[PDB]
Amino acid sequence: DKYRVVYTDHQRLELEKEFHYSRYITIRRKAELAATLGLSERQVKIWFQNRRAKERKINKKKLQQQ
């Protein structure tokens, strides 16, 4: 049992650089990237799902209004 794993900065770099392109992932690029960053398509799926919840959580607060 291994609950979690941290991702190399290079994996986090590329992953993040795609989020900038689209907050959503084509099954092509899901798999195209999965392979070039050596990670399960299911992973690149959840990372993008999670990444959005961050932008959502930042953006909510960036509504400081005050």
Added chain:
DNA sequence: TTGTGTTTTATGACGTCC
């Protein structure tokens, strides 16, 4: 330190789509 507060992987529940 350290303890405590936030950030990063990850899963299951349930929902939407022609």
Added chain:
DNA sequence: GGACGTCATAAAACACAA
């Protein structure tokens, strides 16, 4: 179908005032 989307949540991993 059957792929993905949101979630509430858990726990490893990290950051950093006292």
